[PDB]
Design an enzyme around this catalytic site. Structure first.
Site, PDB file in Angstrom:
ATOM      1  CD  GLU A  31      -1.182   4.086  41.789  1.00  0.00           C
ATOM      2  OE1 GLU A  31      -1.140   3.372  40.766  1.00  0.00           O
ATOM      3  OE2 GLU A  31      -0.624   3.751  42.858  1.00  0.00           O
ATOM      4  N   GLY A  60      -3.349   6.787  46.983  1.00  0.00           N
ATOM      5  CA  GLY A  60      -3.962   7.934  46.338  1.00  0.00           C
ATOM      6  C   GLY A  60      -4.128   7.774  44.848  1.00  0.00           C
ATOM      7  CB  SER A  78       7.407   8.664  49.260  1.00  0.00           C
ATOM      8  OG  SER A  78       7.449   9.901  48.551  1.00  0.00           O
ATOM      9  N   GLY A  79       7.599  10.666  51.000  1.00  0.00           N
ATOM     10  CA  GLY A  79       8.092  11.721  51.866  1.00  0.00           C
ATOM     11  C   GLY A  79       7.077  12.762  52.291  1.00  0.00           C
ATOM     12  CB  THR A 110       4.477   7.284  58.420  1.00  0.00           C
ATOM     13  OG1 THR A 110       5.588   8.113  58.040  1.00  0.00           O
ATOM     14  CG2 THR A 110       4.216   6.237  57.322  1.00  0.00           C
ATOM     15  CG  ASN A 146       5.998   5.809  46.573  1.00  0.00           C
ATOM     16  OD1 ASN A 146       4.969   5.901  47.245  1.00  0.00           O
ATOM     17  ND2 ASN A 146       7.191   6.168  47.036  1.00  0.00           N
ATOM     18  CB  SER A 169       3.557   2.074  46.806  1.00  0.00           C
ATOM     19  OG  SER A 169       2.144   2.131  46.687  1.00  0.00           O
ATOM     20  CB  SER A 170       0.773   0.994  51.744  1.00  0.00           C
ATOM     21  OG  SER A 170       0.297   2.262  51.332  1.00  0.00           O
TER      22      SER A 170
END
Ligand code: CA
Lengths: 156, 808, 145
Positions: free
Chosen positions: B454, B452, B178-179, B183, B228, B231-232
């Protein structure tokens, strides 16, 4: 094994000097074992002195000439008395630009603030004695300081 | 630090000399300072008090608390020279605690970027920083890593040098959640490769042309996972291309492993992909009706399984940017319909009910059917026919009608999934066309985004599915390190005693893939009607319990705390899995007749479906398999993004959180392998300037060869030859060597200072010697001249010639 | 010993000479009692003899110097003393600070007895609780105050 006759005479002559100044009586105060030894030419560290009989205050223990000898002798068994070598690497640790120049401020800082501390007085004196100057900010050639020091107050 | 520590830009990358020297000389005693476990901030620096048995007592240093820690808990902290260290590879103590420090401290000093082996760590600063100036760019233009401080452009630039240099495609794998601004980074990496293409000498920017489509894909490829908000659930490889002159010449996007299952299943606190929910918001009502739906997400079993909405998410607005982005990529508001409709059609396939007579299922309605029948453009009757009772062959055609209710329910789900998949593939294809505004491509530098590693409280077939992947990726890594290091030694003529590093993970991996492996087993166990969760466990237990160190077994937790069934050993630690519905989830059979039948009407539909009965695993296997063949062909570069805290707030550092990331990262796995070898390496010259002091010698520091001294310095300290090897230009050390050397220097120095002081007193006193001597003569002369006087002051005679003469 | 230098032996020749006039050179009883006439300070019978007792008998000049053996024993030359004190006066004359001389005679070097000390303080050239060496050295030999 042991010292030699002349070696003794030498320890002696110095010994006399010291007992003299504190009352020619065959005894030299322990508080001076360091100084004694130095006048013999050795350069003991304070820890080296205490670990060999030395005391700080003046009225604690006395030594006869027969007692110092073995001390002087033992004291001599050590060999990390220090080489120019060791003093260099040592100083270098502080050489910011590798020229051989150290801000007088720092060296003193070292000599004062570090190791077996040294007195403010003691710093000035040694510096005045080996005639070591500082330029604008073309400070002190530590090697200079070094050599001179290891050279003795009475050169020639 | 490199270049000018004082140059304005490098404020957030270097660490001003004065500020360094200062930070590098702080108080320290390798004999008692130390890293120690701390319940609030993971690990803390401390000082040891005393020892006894396997129970050491210590004192912290900020909240100086006396704690009683054990022995295998006292982490040797790195001596100062390593503070703000730039490449953790250089730490002499590569323990967890220590890896935390170097990172934290640097983050708490404004520094984000840090190297740790091939890794280029980056922590999110949560605030704009100068860091990416076109002025700086030139700074990093052609410099080999070592030349400049950390920073992301280095990794990206070299990445470039290597392309043109070795002449072979390059990949950039960046991790982080996420943060992590993962990206941003990829963005900025694209920017860079751009600026450098036109930096030789003579309708949207690359970055934008691509960041342009990221919304549409996110709409179908992301969603909320337990841990999350966005999440892609797929892997995207953004390939940027170049021409013989290192010239940017175009781009295109490949996609791997989309989480199909998600289209028809939700884990309580999770969610189906974002686009489903978006469509059903007060933004484009018309469609909600074209779609044959009511803006009530909850009314569809394929969507409500999990949650409804997430915290800090304004669906609408998204359904917005999405539709807006669909036009930037610019494609028919009609296609745009079909796409949606298809999406919606998935909403009804979950509604279709069924029932059965004896052992043959039949409809329980016909509205949903026609709804899907229409949205797709086929005739319901036939559909239900081919759905409830299809017809196949031999040479003649029997009614493979064997169907029942449990078989259709599965069947319909499958369709949806497949619909969803073809769709996604397509969606991508189109964006690539958006991109293919090209000429001619020769090489590329791709950037891989992949979920990533898990680990949740409850790990299921999904979790294994990702780990499996990640585990095959860490192997990808470890292999790399292996090859390189192997070179790094040959280059320094050092003897190589190591079996490929990737092999370390082969175990687990194999326990997954290979026949009689976890998955395979699952598969066979899927083709058995009465196969039950228990009937699967047993077979696993049967086949692996005591037989393999990698496969183990947990033990019942709480009451609600899900029951585990087995655990594997992933580079990321030990994960425990639950078998629950694997049997169910894994079935993804194809129903041929439905294809051919689905090869009619409506333009896309034709196309999509216009390009046995297997499972998901078989598939997952195929994609991964492909993704890798793709990876191993490229020269890799790894960026590790990292969240510093749960609460998007600069400067802070959540120990546990960072650590966890590091284990999944591989960052810690590298150090693991780094450990088993000679991590620390020194140019002789650097070694000389640092420890000569330890075995000084009369030869001027100027004519002395490095190798020798270094050599001679160690012989002198009698060092287990096992702790180091002498290279052609460096000296390789093992764990904690330098740590000792450093502390012996500090040791020596002080002694050597007490000495100079000693020689000083020697001059100081030896100088008095002469004085004291002269003054002996004096005190004597007096002392004795005074006495002879005391005798004479009363000697009648004495008095006489003391009179008789002044009268001569 | 023989330190009885020429500066000392002649300085003693012109001394015994005047006394003489004794039957061809002999500091004889009369030579003495006579002397105490131009000496400006009285004489006694016993004592005048207790002075002959010193040397065996019959004091020429030779014996005269021998009788002065105790006088040479420590008599280090003139200036030698001056400098000797000098060494302990770092301040341009007015000389040595009393304290010093104490801790310097009493407990430094060939120690003085607390009795040897007093004997010194009675005559002592003092003031400002400080000492005076050139005046003290003066005493040593003597030319009066
Ligand atoms: Ca004495």
């Amino acid at each position: 094994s042991q010292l030699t006759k002349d070696e003794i005479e030498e320890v002696r002559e110095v010994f006399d000097l010291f007992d003299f100044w504190d009352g020619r009586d065959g005894d030299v105060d322990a508080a001076k074992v360091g100084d004694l030894l130095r006048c013999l030419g050795m350069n003991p560290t304070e820890a080296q002195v205490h670990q060999h009989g030395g005391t700080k205050k003046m009225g604690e223990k006395a030594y006869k000439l027969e007692e110092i000898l073995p001390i002087y002798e033992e004291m001599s068994s050590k060999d990390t008395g220090t080489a120019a070598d060791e003093f260099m690497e040592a100083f270098k640790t502080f050489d910011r630009e590798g020229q051989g120049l150290i801000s007088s401020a720092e060296i003193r800082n070292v000599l004062k603030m570090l190791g077996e501390r040294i007195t403010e007085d003691q710093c000035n004196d040694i510096f005045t004695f080996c005639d070591i100057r500082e330029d604008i900010d073309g400070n002190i050639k530590y090697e200079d300081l070094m050599k001179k020091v290891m050279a003795g107050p009475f050169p020639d | 630090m490199t270049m000018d520590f004082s140059d304005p830009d490098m404020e957030f990358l270097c660490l001003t000399r004065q500020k360094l020297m200062e930070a590098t000389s702080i108080p320290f005693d390798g004999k008692k300072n130390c890293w120690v476990p701390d319940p609030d901030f993971g690990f803390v620096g401390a000082e040891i008090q005393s020892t006894k048995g396997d129970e050491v007592t210590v004192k912290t240093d900020k909240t100086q608390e006396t704690r009683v820690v054990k022995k295998d808990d006292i982490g040797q902290r790195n001596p100062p020279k390593f503070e703000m260290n730039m490449d953790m590879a250089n730490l002499t103590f590569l323990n967890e605690a220590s890896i935390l420090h170097n990172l934290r401290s640097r983050y708490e000093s404004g520094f984000i970027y840090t190297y740790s082996g091939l890794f280029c760590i980056a922590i999110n600063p949560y605030r704009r920083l100068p860091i990416y100036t076109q002025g700086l760019v030139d700074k990093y233009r052609g410099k080999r890593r070592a030349e400049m401080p950390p920073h992301l452009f280095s990794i990206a630039d070299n990445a470039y040098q290597y392309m043109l240099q070795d002449r072979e495609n390059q990949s950039m794998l960046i991790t982080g959640e996420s943060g992590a601004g993962k990206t941003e980074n990829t963005k900025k990496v694209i920017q860079y490769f751009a600026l450098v293409a036109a930096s030789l000498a003579g309708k949207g920017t690359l970055e934008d042309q691509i960041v342009q489509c990221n919304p549409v894909l996110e709409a179908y490829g992301n969603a909320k996972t337990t841990r999350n908000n966005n999440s892609s659930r797929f892997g995207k490889f953004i390939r940027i291309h170049f021409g013989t002159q290192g010239k940017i010449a175009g781009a295109d996007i490949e996609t791997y492993l989309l989480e199909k299952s998600r289209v028809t299943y939700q884990q309580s606190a999770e969610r189906n992909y974002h686009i489903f929910y978006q469509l059903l918001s007060p933004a484009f009502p018309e469609n909600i009706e074209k779609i044959l739906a009511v803006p009530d997400p909850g009314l569809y079993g394929f969507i409500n399984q999990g949650t409804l909405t997430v915290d800090g998410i304004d669906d609408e607005e998204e359904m917005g940017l999405t539709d807006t982005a669909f036009d930037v990529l610019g494609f028919t508001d009609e296609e745009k319909l079909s796409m949606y409709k298809c999406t919606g059609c998935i909403l009804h396939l979950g509604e279709m009910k069924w029932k059965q007579r004896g052992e043959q299922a039949e409809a329980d309605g016909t509205a949903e059917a026609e709804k899907v029948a229409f949205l797709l453009g086929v005739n319901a009757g036939d559909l239900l026919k081919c759905l409830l009772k299809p017809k196949i062959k031999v040479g003649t055609e029997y009614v493979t009608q064997g169907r029942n209710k449990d078989q259709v329910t599965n069947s319909i789900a499958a369709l949806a999934k497949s619909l969803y998949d073809r769709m996604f593939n397509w969606l991508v294809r189109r964006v690539n066309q958006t991109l293919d505004t090209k000429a001619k491509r020769q090489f590329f530098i791709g950037v891989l985004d992949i979920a990533g590693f898990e680990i949740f409280d409850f790990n299921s077939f999904e979790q294994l599915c990702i780990n499996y992947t990640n585990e095959r990726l860490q192997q990808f890594f470890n292999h790399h390190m292996f090859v390189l290091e192997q070179e790094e030694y040959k280059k320094e003529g050092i003897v190589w005693e190591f079996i490929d590093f990737g092999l370390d993970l082969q175990a687990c991996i194999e326990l997954i893939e290979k026949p009689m492996g976890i998955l395979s087993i699952l598969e066979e166990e899927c083709m058995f009607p009465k196969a039950s969760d228990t009937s699967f466990k047993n077979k696993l237990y049967d086949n692996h319990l005591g037989k393999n160190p990698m496969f183990g077994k947990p033990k019942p937790p709480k009451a609600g705390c899900a029951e585990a069934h087995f655990c594997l050993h992933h580079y990321a630690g030990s994960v425990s899995y639950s078998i629950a519905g694997w049997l169910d989830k894994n079935k993804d059979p194809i129903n041929e007749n439905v294809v051919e039948l689905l090869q009619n009407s409506k333009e896309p539909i034709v196309k999509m479906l216009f390009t046995a009965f297997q499972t998901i695993s078989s598939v997952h296997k195929e994609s991964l398999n492909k993704l890798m063949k793709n990876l191993y062909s490229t020269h890799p570069h790894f960026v590790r993004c990292i969240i510093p805290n749960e609460l998007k707030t600069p400067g802070l550092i959540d120990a546990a959180l960072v650590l966890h990331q590091l284990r999944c990262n591989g960052v810690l796995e590298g150090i693991r392998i780094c450990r088993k070898g000679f991590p620390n390496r020194i140019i002789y010259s650097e070694f000389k300037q640092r420890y000569s002091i330890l075995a000084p010698n009369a030869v001027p520091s100027g004519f002395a060869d490095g190798k020798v001294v270094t050599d001679k310095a160690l012989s002198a300290l009698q060092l287990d030859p096992n702790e180091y090897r002498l290279g052609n230009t460096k000296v390789f050390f093992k764990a904690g060597v330098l740590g000792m050397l450093e502390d012996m220097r500090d040791e020596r120095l002080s002694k050597i200072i007490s000495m100079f002081q000693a020689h000083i007193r020697g001059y100081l006193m030896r100088k008095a010697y002469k004085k004291l001597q002269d003054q002996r003569i004096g005190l004597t002369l007096i002392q004795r001249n005074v006495r002879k006087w005391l005798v004479l002051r009363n000697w009648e005679w004495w008095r006489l010639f003391n009179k008789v003469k002044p009268l001569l | 010993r023989v330190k009885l230098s020429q500066r000392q032996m002649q300085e003693l020749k012109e001394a015994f000479t005047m006394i003489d006039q004794d039957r061809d050179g002999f500091i004889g009883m009369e030579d003495l009692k006579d002397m105490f006439s131009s000496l400006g300070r009285v004489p006694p019978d016993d004592e005048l003899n207790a002075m002959l007792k010193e040397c065996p008998g019959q004091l020429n000049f030779t014996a005269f110097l021998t009788l002065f053996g105790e006088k040479v024993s420590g008599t280090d030359p003139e200036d030698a003393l001056r400098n000797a004190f000098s060494m302990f006066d770092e301040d341009g004359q007015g000389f040595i600070p009393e304290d010093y001389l104490k801790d310097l005679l009493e407990n430094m070097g060939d120690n003085f007895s607390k009795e040897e000390i007093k004997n010194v303080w009675k005559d002592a050239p003092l003031k400002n609780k400080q000492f005076n060496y050139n005046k003290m050295v003066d005493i040593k030999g003597k030319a009066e105050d």
